[PDB]
């Protein structure tokens, strides 16, 4: 069944009130539900059809009378159909009692058990796995929810809204009633039951001075890992107050960590539920990455609230409207909190590798897709991250003042209602008119960012007239046709630009954002005293392929002297890409022609000099430094190479790294040593609320350099690796494991770091990732060992992802020409699909580039996908995904 965006129609029914009784027992959960319903104006005499998946019916009723199966209703484990003649024509009550089984719900959607916690996950279509409903986001209702359970096992009971009663029940049971008066969609329903321990605090809002109770919950074992999350939550509330002027609406906010979770987290009006790996940390038991991760995920779920309780999605095709906007808000927050340029760079790095790959793949879709089969497959980097860049472009175009005005308009015009992407665009259009002082100005073209798939390519030509002091930038845009649009239209592309004086490194013009609205345009600047070097797409101002057409000499100058972090980073990226493409072709030619000898173009010496210059600048940023000594991601590179031979790419990278290392290793070593004091400072190691993003960037730089030195077998570096393994910081001692791969000390550090990791669930998952990603010739044997000794038959998605996904980035080994790596991951996907289709689809990620590889590896991957597609028991999720991915 395929759902089309253009087919939207309001329900012929209304659900005004939901009254739930959820009774949790050892081997079953009984759910009783009364829905106070009505008939809408759009009703035309149709059957009453409820969603309900996997429910065991004890009984159903209309107005307290039992309905009879076959005669009055049918149920096929997916839809409950009540024939219209038995459906009332005014306000009526529908009631049901069903049985569900969270203890065996390993798909982690609906109501399920995670270790000793019962928790729900209803977005997007999970509420129908709990009870019957018209499970769509535009069905708004009031909720009154009662939960009962064994008191010893489940002392803490949580749901949306206010707890209004707590009571004892015979047999050592207890119950709690929660009433949530404001209307909400059912995907925001949540319930939690467990032996939860917590940290708490009180927050006083900025403008109304009201006290908000903040609680963060986990199992008792890890309660000491809750402090950073609580800090992050306070930080999020402060930010939305300061930047957007928005206060929290309710009197309490709960965050709950659970061990088994399909994604990162979920917002549920006051009851936010998190993957433990995105909420829990301690300096002793977490790598540095956890700290930015918790900050962004807690922020993200928090920024969902204000907008979520005023404007609900009309339908799921508007997903990017809530998610792209919330990621944009999350990124603004994260940039302001970390105060490091690597934060924005890391978002760009992710978009241009993972999301660009997706957008040039058979899975390519606009941020507002035209159809879906399985909602779970729609939560993509395109909808989220390209969505966020589209939301961010409004800010670039409008500036802060008018952006913040269009944002307010969108709320006002749409408060209390459902909205669409057009509603948001209309609101910004009003801000655009006010900014341009022109009520004929419009953003109608901007709507193509929602409807048009594929990554635009933007290219440049320049002209300078020295006598006229006149500089011209000629710009061209193009999007490649694909399966979604035969003809692509030009987009509204904002191009933030500067002009750098090559003679002194100074800005030559004020902040300027070119508005490209045609297929091509020419932008002319007068009174330009000398030929500039253009600094293009500052801040990465549009989600596009940038073809800067600059020389490497110009790129080096930008890298050294430009003011914009992204353009410096991109200029470096572009120098590397030119080099990678050149050496790749030279290696490829030698392979194809079976050459006994051949030449390779060396790495630009002035480029190596510039890297040295930056590394040696004490005033330059450590995180930025770690980027400039790293080649572009493999998934970024592949967008530029047809029929990519992964072996040839691996030889290419090897050559380039060795060229630069042969010149700079002594520099790397010196810096690795000199950075130690500040990077590994222990002054605040036992203060869980003290987080220093610069210091963590220094550790990133040290660990990056150590990797480079280890690969290069720098004299006596093993000494440094061994000492590194003794560091209190897990980022350090896990790095010592992965860099020791090049030495016969590896399995000793394997055992040491395992013993350090095994008693913390999340830390062990980081250990697994480190092992999985290790550059080992015997990695296949090592993975087998992990399966047998550690992973076993765990159904925890964190465990499974930890063991397998990092390995799939091993360019040389995962892409083994035998196809053994493809075969291995396909076996894991098919195995996982039996109990968790959402996670099975996640494990398909390496296959997304299948049609970009050399013809042999294309065939190998295709064979595995077709094998998976032929499994009789294949889930709808996995089938849809592989059908789309293989163009069937
Ligand atoms: N940065 C980052 C990376 C990875 C995942 C997430 C993440 O957890 N995103 C969630 C979100 O938006 N929460 O509000 C989220 C919520 C629900 C789904 N979902 C998929 C299918 C059904 N539901 C997916 C993601 C964030
Ligand atoms: Mg069932
Ligand atoms: Zn979200």
């Amino acid at each position: 069944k395929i759902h089309y965006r253009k087919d939207y129609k309001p329900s012929g029914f209304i659900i005004n009130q939901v009254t739930l009784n959820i009774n949790i027992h050892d081997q079953e959960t009984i759910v009783r539900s009364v829905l106070d319903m009505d008939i809408s104006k759009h009703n035309v005499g149709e059957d009453l059809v409820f969603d309900g998946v996997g429910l065991k019916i004890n009984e159903i009723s209309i107005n307290n009378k039992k309905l009879v199966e076959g005669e009055e209703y049918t149920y096929d484990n997916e839809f409950l159909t009540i024939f219209s003649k038995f459906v009332p024509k005014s306000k009526f009550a529908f009631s049901s009692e069903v049985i569900i089984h969270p203890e065996t719900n390993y798909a982690l959607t609906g109501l399920y058990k995670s270790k000793n916690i019962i928790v729900s996950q209803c977005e997007a279509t999970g509420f129908r796995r709990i009870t019957f409903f018209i499970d769509r986001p535009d069905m708004m209702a009031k909720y009154d929810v009662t939960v009962t359970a064994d008191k010893e096992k489940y002392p803490v009971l949580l749901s949306n809204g206010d707890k209004v009663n707590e009571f004892e029940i015979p047999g050592g049971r207890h119950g709690a009633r929660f009433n949530d008066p404001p209307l909400k969609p059912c995907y925001l329903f949540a319930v939690v039951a467990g032996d939860l321990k917590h940290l708490s605090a009180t927050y006083i809002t900025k403008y109304t001075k009201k006290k908000v109770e903040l609680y963060v919950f986990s199992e008792e074992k890890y309660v000491s890992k809750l402090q950073w999350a609580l800090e992050c939550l306070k930080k999020s509330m402060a930010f939305d107050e300061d930047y957007f002027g928005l206060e929290y609406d309710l009197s309490r906010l709960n965050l709950v960590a659970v061990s088994d979770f399909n994604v990162g987290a979920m917002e549920n009006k006051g009851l936010n539920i998190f993957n433990a790996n995105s909420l829990l940390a301690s300096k002793k038991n977490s790598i540095d990455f956890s700290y930015a991760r918790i900050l962004t995920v807690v922020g993200h779920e928090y920024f969902h609230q204000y907008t979520g309780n005023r404007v609900t999605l009309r339908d799921w095709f508007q997903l990017t409207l809530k998610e792209g906007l919330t990621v944009h808000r999350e990124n603004l927050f994260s940039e302001e909190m970390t105060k490091t340029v690597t934060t924005r760079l890391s978002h760009v790095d992710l978009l241009r590798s993972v999301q660009f790959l997706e957008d040039s793949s058979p899975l390519s879709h606009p941020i507002r897709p035209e159809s879906y089969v399985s909602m779970e497959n729609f939560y993509t980097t395109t909808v989220y991250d390209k969505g966020s860049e589209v939301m961010r472009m409004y800010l670039t175009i409008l500036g802060e003042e008018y952006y913040k005005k269009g944002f307010d308009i969108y709320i006002k015009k749409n408060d209390g209602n459902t909205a669409t992407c057009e509603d948001f665009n209309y609101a910004m259009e009003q801000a655009y008119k006010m900014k341009k002082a022109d009520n004929s100005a419009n953003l109608n073209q901007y709507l193509l960012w929602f409807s048009q798939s594929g990554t635009p390519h933007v290219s440049f030509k320049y002209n300078y007239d020295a006598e006229k002091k006149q500089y011209s930038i000629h710009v061209n845009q193009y999007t490649k046709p694909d399966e979604n649009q035969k003809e692509k239209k030009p987009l509204f592309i904002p191009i933030s630009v500067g002009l750098i004086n090559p003679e002194n490194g100074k800005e030559m013009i004020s902040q300027t954002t070119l508005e490209l609205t045609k297929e091509s345009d020419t932008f002319v600047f007068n009174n330009i005293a000398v030929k500039p070097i253009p600094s293009l797409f500052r801040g990465f101002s549009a989600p596009v392929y940038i073809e800067d057409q600059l020389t490497d000499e110009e790129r080096i100058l930008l890298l050294k002297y430009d003011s914009d972090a992204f353009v410096r980073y991109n200029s470096c990226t572009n120098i590397y890409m030119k080099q990678i493409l050149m050496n790749y072709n030279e290696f490829l030619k030698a392979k194809n022609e079976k050459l006994e000898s051949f030449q390779l173009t060396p790495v630009n010496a002035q480029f190596i000099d510039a890297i040295k210059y930056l590394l040696e600048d004490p005033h330059a940023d450590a995180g930025f430094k770690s980027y400039i000594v790293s080649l572009p991601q493999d998934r970024y590179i592949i967008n530029f190479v047809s029929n990519l031979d992964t072996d040839v790419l691996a030889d290419t990278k090897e050559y380039i790294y060795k060229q630069i290392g042969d010149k700079l290793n002594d520099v790397y070593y010196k810096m690795f040593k000199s950075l130690e004091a500040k990077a590994d400072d222990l002054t605040y190691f036992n203060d869980e609320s003290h987080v220093d993003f610069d210091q963590m960037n220094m550790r990133t730089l040290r660990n990056t350099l150590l990797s480079l030195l280890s690969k290069a077998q720098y004299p006596n570096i093993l000494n440094e690796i061994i000492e590194h393994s003794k560091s209190p910081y897990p980022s350090n001692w896990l790095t010592s494991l992965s860099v020791s791969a090049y030495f016969d000390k590896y399995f000793e550090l394997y055992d040491k770091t395992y013993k350090l990791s095994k008693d913390d669930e999340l830390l062990l998952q980081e250990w697994l990732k480190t092992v999985s990603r290790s550059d080992r010739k015997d990695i296949y044997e090592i993975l087998k060992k992990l399966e047998n000794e550690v992973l076993k038959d765990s159904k925890n998605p964190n465990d499974i992802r930890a063991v397998y996904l990092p390995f799939t980035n091993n360019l040389r080994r995962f892409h083994d020409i035998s196809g053994k790596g493809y075969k291995l991951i396909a076996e894991v996907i098919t195995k996982t699909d039996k109990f968790n289709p959402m996670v099975a689809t996640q494990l398909c990620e390496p296959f997304k580039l299948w049609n970009k590889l050399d013809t042999k590896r294309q065939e190998l991957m295709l064979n595995e996908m077709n094998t998976m597609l032929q499994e009789p028991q294949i889930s709808n999720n996995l089938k849809e995904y592989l059908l789309r991915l293989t163009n069937k």
Side-chain angles (χ1 to χ4, degrees), residues 239 243 330-340 343:
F239 180 77
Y243 191 91
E330 169 206 336
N331 292 340
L332 291 175
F333 168 65
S334 176
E335 294 177 38
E336 174 70 16
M337 293 300 105
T338 61
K339 286 299 186 184
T340 57
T343 297

Side-chain angles (χ1 to χ4, degrees), residues 123 265 267 300-301 304 322-323 326-327 384:
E123 189 173 352
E267 87 291 1
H300 179 107
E301 308 312 333
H304 270 305
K322 80 176 170 79
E323 296 303 335
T326 300
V327 174
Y384 276 64

Side-chain angles (χ1 to χ4, degrees), residues 347-367:
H347 306 151
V348 180
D349 205 79
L350 174 80
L351 186 85
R352 297 206 301 185
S353 54
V354 178
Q355 195 279 328
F356 281 15
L357 186 163
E358 178 168 275
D359 229 343
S360 66
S361 81
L363 293 169
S364 176
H365 52 280
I367 62 173

Side-chain angles (χ1 to χ4, degrees), residues 67 69-70 72-79:
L67 307 186
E69 165 173 50
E72 293 171 311
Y73 81 86
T74 58
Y75 177 55
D76 61 5
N77 207 40
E78 182 176 17
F79 304 109

Side-chain angles (χ1 to χ4, degrees), residues 841-852:
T841 297
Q842 295 168 354
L843 295 171
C844 286
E845 185 167 11
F847 288 104
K848 294 174 82 181
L849 49 57
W850 71 273
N851 64 347
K852 303 304 181 230

